[PDB]
Amino acid sequence: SNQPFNQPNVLQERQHLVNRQLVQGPNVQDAIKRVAIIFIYKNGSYRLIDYNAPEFINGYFNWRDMLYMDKPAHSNRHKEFENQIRRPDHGDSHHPELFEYPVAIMISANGNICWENVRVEVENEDCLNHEDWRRARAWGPRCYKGSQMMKCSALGRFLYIPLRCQNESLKFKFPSRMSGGDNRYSSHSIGQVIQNNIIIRNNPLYLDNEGDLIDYMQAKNLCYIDSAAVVDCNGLAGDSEC
Amino acid sequence: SNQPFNQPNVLQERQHLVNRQLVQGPNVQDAIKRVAIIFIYKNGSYRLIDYNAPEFINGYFNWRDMLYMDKPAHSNRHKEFENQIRRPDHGDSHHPELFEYPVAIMISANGNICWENVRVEVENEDCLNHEDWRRARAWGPRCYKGSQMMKCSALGRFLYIPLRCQNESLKFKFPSRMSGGDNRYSSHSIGQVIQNNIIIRNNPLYLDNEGDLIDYMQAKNLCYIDSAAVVDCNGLAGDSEC
Amino acid sequence: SNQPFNQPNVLQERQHLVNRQLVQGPNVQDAIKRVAIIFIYKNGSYRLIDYNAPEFINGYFNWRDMLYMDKPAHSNRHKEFENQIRRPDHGDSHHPELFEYPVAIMISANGNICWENVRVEVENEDCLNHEDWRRARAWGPRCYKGSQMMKCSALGRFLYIPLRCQNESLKFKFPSRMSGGDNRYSSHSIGQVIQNNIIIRNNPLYLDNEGDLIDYMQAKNLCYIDSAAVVDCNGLAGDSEC
Ligand SMILES: O=c1ccn([C@@H]2O[C@H](COP(=O)(O)OP(=O)(O)OP(=O)(O)O)[C@@H](O)[C@H]2O)c(=O)[nH]1
Ligand SMILES: O=c1ccn([C@@H]2O[C@H](COP(=O)(O)OP(=O)(O)OP(=O)(O)O)[C@@H](O)[C@H]2O)c(=O)[nH]1
Ligand SMILES: O=c1ccn([C@@H]2O[C@H](COP(=O)(O)OP(=O)(O)OP(=O)(O)O)[C@@H](O)[C@H]2O)c(=O)[nH]1
């Protein structure tokens, strides 16, 4: 007799592990986490700031950092508006709003992130969470938390923030999960955590429309929910029906 | 009989606690600390940089960071002056001094700060505290300390630094006090300290004159001693005579 | 009798200790470490960024940070090129290469540095070490290590990096050695390490030619190997033949 039906089936498995690798890769300690801060402007276009780090992504946008471009030609206008906002009434500023101050923020946070410890806070013009610094803290009662970000998958969550005023700024923290109960802020591991956490702030990108934006998010595999509330990217691997 | 003289006196106490709150609020762990770095220029006006953080405010101004505005129209002039200063004699620079290099620094430090551990250092053109980097350290023997800052109150101290040259830069550290003997750089607390310490550097503000400056310091409740050595703001709460 | 041949010989020793001081000075804990990142451009000139810190020098250059000057007059060109590079094909960019993107990097690292823990990595256009962020880590398999930097002396090593493409960026880490087996990331010492590590990024300097560059490196006593592979500066003290 003879048994010729021994076609190997390792290929299926190799591809399968490549698929799992993309989903589990982010969960290895010192794997990269990736956050996209996306501002929407009055011209309907976007400015996207891409962050990555292996321990935690924190940072801020002061009031000035919120603006669309802030070119030399508009520096005086922006200076005076900033004066009026951050020190009324000392700005030679003649309009209630700037064309270049955003109308909303979208945040795509991706990776092995401790959602419980995530903080996203819309601060005032001095980047504080209280009117008086003497009552301000690291984070306040109006802070956004991880569970408030819309879940796209196990890898990514997405937050929408309307800006109904033009005096606000932004402060955020997206920290890694540890490996089980191993706190790497222990003496064994903390030196490496501190020295490895180089928080990359890539130069802001300008995207004309939401089609181009969806394309970017899908290209970089960062989760995105479009203006119609449809999840177009969730950070996960491609697959066919099970 | 009847006892109609029972007018409540809780109101006095409520206001009183609001007053104490502003003075004690800064002393809660993870309360915000606030520092204003103020440069004075040859046009008699000011450039103010507002910092806040919950663990410690450190940072620096390299030589270029010292300048008033540094607009594109003056970029070449400033580049060449920087060359001559930081690498003599390689600058096509034709004047001993720049109009836009400051003549003095004022620092208003406010909050629950460990004054013993405060460091403010006027560095050389390479932002080092010795002529030769091989003898330079984190801090040097000419470093300003907390006790050298003029005390305005329990909440705030104020330092004046004359700049008699135009080759100097700045490095500083304003760290929080701990709660008694609880070192939060212990393994229990340090992760939070590190991830919470997002040092906000607000965009520099331009203030025309000292009247406008006093107004700002009083509005933001940051301590200030004016050019006549009078304490105009001390970070404390308003009150009537005791 | 009389013994008039008692000419003192302390002077020799005083100078000798001054010489040793420059070589050993960097090895005191909290002594400064100094790193020069030097880019070479298509006009044959250099842009040098001078860093110093007492605990560790880490940082990065995102893609935009790589460019020579990036003046307002060339902002549009640079924006569009960045678009095409970081999000193809969304840049209105008409040339394969920019005049202002560097052709090589030279890194002079100097001081009491733990060469074993040094990391210098040429990242892609998103400043990641893998094509897909989900497989990216703090550092990757193509990372440069301390032993790959050409040794100039006990104080300094020098690395050359050719840039054969124009999509790459940079991330680096140069950490201090500890005093023997005393890990200052222990609870006793870590607060000071964290608060003292103010990583100075001096404004980029523009140097016309290699003669001017050699002069700078020798003036600042940072190690340098010239285009002919000759060590012109090694960070050590001057001396006569032994
Ligand atoms: O960030 C921005 C940028 C531009 N702009 C808008 O650009 C326009 C350019 O200014 P104008 O076109 O109105 O010229 P102008 O000299 O009359 O300016 P003002 O009298 O208003 O000072 C201004 O009217 C302003 O509203 C903003 O409001 N915000
Ligand atoms: O930061 C600054 C800004 C401006 N300035 C001053 O602005 C003035 C503008 O320069 P000028 O008005 O003298 O024109 P110019 O072409 O003659 O310039 P030079 O011959 O001096 O190169 C210069 O004389 C300079 O002293 C500074 O010195 N420092
Ligand atoms: O970073 C830089 C800076 C300058 N340049 C170069 O400067 C030159 C200035 O551009 P041109 O002198 O070609 O004028 P132009 O209006 O024809 O520009 P294009 O048609 O090429 O858009 C361009 O040809 C560009 O190649 C760079 O390529 N990269």
UniProtKB/TrEMBL annotation, chains A, B, C:
<feature type="binding site">
    <location>
        <position position="78"/>
    </location>
    <ligand>
        <name>UTP</name>
    </ligand>
</feature>
<protein>
    <submittedName>
        <fullName>Polyhedrin</fullName>
    </submittedName>
</protein>
<dbReference type="Pfam" id="PF17515">
    <property type="entry name" value="CPV_Polyhedrin"/>
</dbReference>
<feature type="binding site">
    <location>
        <position position="100"/>
    </location>
    <ligand>
        <name>UTP</name>
    </ligand>
</feature>
<feature type="binding site">
    <location>
        <position position="99"/>
    </location>
    <ligand>
        <name>UTP</name>
    </ligand>
</feature>
<feature type="binding site">
    <location>
        <position position="95"/>
    </location>
    <ligand>
        <name>UTP</name>
    </ligand>
</feature>
<feature type="binding site">
    <location>
        <position position="94"/>
    </location>
    <ligand>
        <name>UTP</name>
    </ligand>
</feature>
<feature type="binding site">
    <location>
        <position position="77"/>
    </location>
    <ligand>
        <name>UTP</name>
    </ligand>
</feature>
<dbReference type="InterPro" id="IPR035239">
    <property type="entry name" value="CPV_Polyhedrin"/>
</dbReference>
